[PDB]
Design an enzyme around this catalytic site. Sequence first.
Site, PDB file in Angstrom:
ATOM      1  N   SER B 143       0.816  -1.207   0.000  1.00  0.00           N
ATOM      2  CA  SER B 143       0.000   0.000   0.000  1.00  0.00           C
ATOM      3  C   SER B 143       0.855   1.266   0.000  1.00  0.00           C
ATOM      4  O   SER B 143       0.530   2.244  -0.685  1.00  0.00           O
ATOM      5  CB  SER B 143      -0.940   0.012   1.214  1.00  0.00           C
ATOM      6  OG  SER B 143      -1.934  -0.995   1.116  1.00  0.00           O
ATOM      7  N   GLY B 400     -25.457 -26.769   2.619  1.00  0.00           N
ATOM      8  CA  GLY B 400     -24.369 -27.727   2.512  1.00  0.00           C
ATOM      9  C   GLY B 400     -23.720 -27.870   1.147  1.00  0.00           C
ATOM     10  O   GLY B 400     -22.486 -27.837   1.035  1.00  0.00           O
ATOM     11  N   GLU B 423      -4.290  -2.751  -5.837  1.00  0.00           N
ATOM     12  CA  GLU B 423      -4.619  -1.375  -6.195  1.00  0.00           C
ATOM     13  C   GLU B 423      -4.895  -0.559  -4.938  1.00  0.00           C
ATOM     14  O   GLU B 423      -5.562   0.473  -4.988  1.00  0.00           O
ATOM     15  CB  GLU B 423      -5.830  -1.318  -7.131  1.00  0.00           C
ATOM     16  CG  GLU B 423      -5.448  -1.229  -8.595  1.00  0.00           C
ATOM     17  CD  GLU B 423      -4.565  -0.031  -8.880  1.00  0.00           C
ATOM     18  OE1 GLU B 423      -4.993   1.109  -8.592  1.00  0.00           O
ATOM     19  OE2 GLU B 423      -3.440  -0.224  -9.392  1.00  0.00           O
TER      20      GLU B 423
END
EC number: 1.3.3.6
Lengths: 655, 658
Positions: B143, B400, B423
């Site tokens: 980041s 299930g 991104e």
Amino acid sequence: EGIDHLADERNKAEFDVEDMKIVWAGSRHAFEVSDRIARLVASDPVFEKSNRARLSRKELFKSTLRKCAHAFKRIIELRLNEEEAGRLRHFIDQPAYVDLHWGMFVPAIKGQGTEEQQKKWLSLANKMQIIGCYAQTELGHGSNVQGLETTATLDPKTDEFVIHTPTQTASKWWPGGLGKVSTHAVVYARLITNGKDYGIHGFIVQLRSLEDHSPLPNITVGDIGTKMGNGAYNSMDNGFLMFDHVRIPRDQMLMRLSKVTREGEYVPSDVPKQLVYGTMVYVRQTIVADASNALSRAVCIATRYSAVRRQFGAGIETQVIDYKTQQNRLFPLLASAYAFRFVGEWLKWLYTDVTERLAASDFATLPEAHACTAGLKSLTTTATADGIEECRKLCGGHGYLWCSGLPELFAVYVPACTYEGDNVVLQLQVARFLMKTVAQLGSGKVPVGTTAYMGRAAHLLQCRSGVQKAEDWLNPDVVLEAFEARALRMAVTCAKNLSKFENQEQGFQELLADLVEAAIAHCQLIVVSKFIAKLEQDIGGKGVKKQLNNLCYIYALYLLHKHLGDFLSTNCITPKQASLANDQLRSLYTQVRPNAVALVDAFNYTDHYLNSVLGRYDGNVYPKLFEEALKDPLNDSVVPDGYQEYLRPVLQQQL
Amino acid sequence: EGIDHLADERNKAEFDVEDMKIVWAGSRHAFEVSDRIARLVASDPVFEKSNRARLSRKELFKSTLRKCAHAFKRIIELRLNEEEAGRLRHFIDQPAYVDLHWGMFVPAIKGQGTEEQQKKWLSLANKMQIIGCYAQTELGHGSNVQGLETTATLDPKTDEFVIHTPTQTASKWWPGGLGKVSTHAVVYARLITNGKDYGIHGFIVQLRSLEDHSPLPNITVGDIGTKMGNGAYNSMDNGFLMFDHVRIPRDQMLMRLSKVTREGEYVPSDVPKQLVYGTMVYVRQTIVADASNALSRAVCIATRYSAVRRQFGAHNGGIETQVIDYKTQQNRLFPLLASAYAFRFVGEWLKWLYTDVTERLAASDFATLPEAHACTAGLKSLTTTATADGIEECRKLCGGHGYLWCSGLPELFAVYVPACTYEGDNVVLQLQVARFLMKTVAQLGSGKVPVGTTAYMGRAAHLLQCRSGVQKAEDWLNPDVVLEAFEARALRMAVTCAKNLSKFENQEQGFQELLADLVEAAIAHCQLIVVSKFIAKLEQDIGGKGVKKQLNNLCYIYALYLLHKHLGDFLSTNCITPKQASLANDQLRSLYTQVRPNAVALVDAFNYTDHYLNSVLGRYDGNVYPKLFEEALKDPLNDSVVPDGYQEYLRPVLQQQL
Ligand SMILES: Cc1cc2nc3c(=O)[nH]c(=O)nc-3n(C[C@H](O)[C@H](O)[C@H](O)COP(=O)(O)OP(=O)(O)OC[C@H]3O[C@@H](n4cnc5c(N)ncnc54)[C@H](O)[C@@H]3O)c2cc1C
Ligand SMILES: Cc1cc2nc3c(=O)[nH]c(=O)nc-3n(C[C@H](O)[C@H](O)[C@H](O)COP(=O)(O)OP(=O)(O)OC[C@H]3O[C@@H](n4cnc5c(N)ncnc54)[C@H](O)[C@@H]3O)c2cc1C
Ligand SMILES: [Ca+2]
Ligand SMILES: [Cl-]
Ligand SMILES: [Cl-]
Ligand SMILES: [Pt+2]
Ligand SMILES: [Pt+2]
Ligand SMILES: [Pt+2]
Ligand SMILES: [Pt+2]
Ligand SMILES: [Pt+2]
Ligand SMILES: [Pt+2]
């Protein structure tokens, strides 16, 4: 090297982690036993599982059979008792047929089989002379067991039961250990005798020969296929099973609760069916306990990695765990892990009570014990499943790697939300209980137990919180009044709208969504009250009860904020007071921050068990990520297989 | 065989599905091209992917290289244009190096390369004489791009850039297509020249020889390992990369906005730096658009299976009720169906925004740049988060059987989740929006009024002191009533955050203390945008019997669902009372009942082939159970009734011979 790079984090602890380890374990004996067996498993090469995502389905399954066989051998050679054996399987941490053999097959025979049947079948099962599974669910029916299609018709001429699969949708589907392992199974089907259907009953049926393991005549069996996640349940042989008029002796029907004589007459035994709490009270308590275990593993990994990972806030960057967003996402999960752990203990008391109840022929608290436990199972498994995935996101990009330990943890745990009862369906049962209870408001009946707060409906329905400052939200009476008023208001509002429809069952269906929320509010109240109650006990260890108190109110104030709308709708809490609760919550995050790592160390998990590079005890993450990458099979060669045929021709401009 | 078990459900539709299909596609041209290419992929044996979970890492990767090569061949033999080629890769539905080559490597050289650099490298890339990847992220930094450790130091005496990996944490990590395929890559590192660090820049670096694919001298490259889920992104070779003082020509530095003379002088170009954000607004726009794609797939599966699956509610002697008839199922599924369309429309708007911003940007008009960036970042965060959670929720909606890989949901979730991190981390992105909102609030409409998506922040007059006139449930279907509620709620939260900030000596300290609150306010702002764009969409001319009516239903389901989910935020404004809140809930309930008969048709509008959906539970014909059995038989574990390992690990146990 093994040097602990999180030592500076651990030194911040304002309590002795060793004392918190006992609290988490539940007792010193539980801690010692688990810690010993854990180390035992971790030190055994056969139980390695760091390459579990590099093997094929077949190889993974075979490796699982090997671990199971080895486990059995170690149990005998080491003469491990039941407790130690159970802890051994727990730390092997790999879904296998053995979990259902001991966890459902045996228990089903103990509670539903006669003494003679138990003597015979339990003797074979306990010594592994046979391997059984729990074949109940079918392609077309899971939650609604009453709708099973498999049939068992008695044959008066041969004194045998004819097990048949009428249609393809009647095929058994999902049973663990059924696909390839089990030689026998407790099959549930519609009992038919004298041309009458008497409902669902359990029948013992041999599936495979004990000589060559080949399927017996007219038996169709196999694995249902690959499931979610790398590894996880793929080590388990979940299967399907179909019967083509398969025959079994009459005496192979579990006849403790009811029997079918040679004459073919159905006879309901004189045994109290109310004692069937062996499949819905103790079992769900283990499920609730498993939730705390699963959530704690995820939080442990995310907490350590958050103290290691630095990003933004710079020279050196800030540890992500220092960010209030990271704390507001992680700390409530740490508080929930402890909250579920304690609620799981209270459920152990309830069992001892409900059992104490089925003695003096008292079935007066059964209705509450059923809904309470059902709602808790739903609440904890849902919260735990979401929390594990959130822990993966809290680890950023690296959490997407299998070796992070988080992807497989989520995949392997998520089934908890469906098996043994769909989470939504279970909460609807609580909603029905709450409506029947509210229907008693003003009747003169005095509600008790988890609904006892409904007796104070007069005050709770018109209350106003006395909160004037942030610290007031640390008062148990203030928090409890808030949650009780919220839950009551929601339940009363549903009941009032439910009487606005002509057909009762119709209005219920029309309001199912509102009913589920009311039920959840009631369940959260229960968890919050049990965390507060636990704090009243004598917990040893300097600063220990202080941290548990911090987590108790983080859990409570977090849910208050998350469901603020419910509380504000009751007008017994104002927005100003909600804002004060948020200030207290933030202040609690800051107090817990320094204790974070030590709080997950209290889980006493070995790196082997966590199986996480990001959550390593020593905080040596990055170097270990690279080390694991090199082990991937794709790195077996520098030039990928397929280069000559699918890459060079492209690059070389030859199509 | 050929029976449609959902035939009756499709006859319940109160709108013509064929017209709704055009709405989803965006136009008849888009619909036609997609429908054609979709069928072309489904019918090609090479593009089979239902067996993807039965392949080893190696076989899956090899199969991926094969599919990509076959794709290149088909594009040439069929003479497909760029649009068709994109749709082809889209339906092949398999993460591969090709996605990064066309999606990042090329776009990077185009926006950051010089005119002379573009025609030299793009000529190679477009013809695929080279295969590139985007190598930015490192072990220690994702980041925070400004924290990258890789360095690029110029060597005047040789006119070369020395790329180096200072420490292990400086190693590139995650780049798709880097692991084993890419021969070249755009590498980002700190530009070092004249003894000064000038920040992160892009540099073209050759990784492997174009003759034998062998790694060039001083290049350490490989795959980072197996990722979440069976199949999914495991067909992608995400890798690591380390440079031991690698050398590259000075001219291999992307120099469109920044130059480095032969004497090592750093000289900014005459091109505005802001003429690069144009690509990120694009990449983020594609992500938002991708959200509707992934969400609609999951919703289509859960909706069809919900109509097929019956459980409880047996009336006519054994006839159980379709689970899709239960309000809890509707309350969990319908909001996701509504969100799929909501994200599709907001995605359409974001496209228009991309152009507009790009246009004005070409005229050095950066007036709307700040807003454009906030919206894009926030929407990317909002939609990806909502979609990822929505996909997993659709799996739970299938009970299930949803746990089986052949349900198509497990892999879809695993392959989609990276959207919340690549991104930019979703929480980090929302904090940027918060900062933007705080600055907008700081500028009290005194200097230049708030316009665009923050224009409402200007009418803080009646907003921060309103009282909805809602007196009946039906009133919540009024666009002005909904917009007012969402604008007030967002503005109120933002103004509150600003005031609480102002009471701190150090503004950055206060910002950090209230991070959680700031993210919630930014989320409320982004939701308002989605709601407003959906309401705006309904103002357009949309043909088709009952089409607009169904979109109207979904529009208000989305809004009323969020109002209920974030009820606490609205009740704090005093502009909405508990009674009016209860009326919104009644309206929401009624909208579910209205959408119920239209559900199946609303997902058929997506026009997905069974091949693309790759789901047994979501099959178009609803022939679920028989197909579940058919798939089970394909598992390798069923190659024999007696499992391998039986003789060694099962027989000994059953005979007490341990
Ligand atoms: C990994 C795994 C292992 C298992 N092992 C075993 C085993 O060993 N033995 C065995 O017998 N079974 C086993 N099961 C089956 C399991 O115990 C449950 O029976 C099954 O998962 C129930 O799910 P379902 O498919 O019936 O869901 P359903 O009940 O069909 O529900 C599907 C959807 O409809 C909704 N719904 C259903 N009914 C209602 C209602 N009345 N009101 C509102 N909503 C409703 C549900 O909430 C859900 O959204 C296993 C399952 C799994 C996934
Ligand atoms: C499948 C996949 C493919 C990828 N492909 C590429 C590629 O092709 N090329 C490339 O260059 N990269 C690639 N990436 C990397 C990606 O684009 C991002 O750079 C990376 O995933 C960001 O995550 P992180 O580890 O940096 O998380 P971080 O940003 O470190 O965040 C981790 C945690 O800390 C929190 N946090 C961090 N900073 C703050 C803050 N300032 N305030 C509050 N909280 C904060 C986050 O919210 C999160 O909870 C890929 C990633 C993945 C998963
Ligand atoms: Ca350290
Ligand atoms: Cl996984
Ligand atoms: Cl998967
Ligand atoms: Pt009997
Ligand atoms: Pt029960
Ligand atoms: Pt180290
Ligand atoms: Pt059919
Ligand atoms: Pt240049
Ligand atoms: Pt940007």
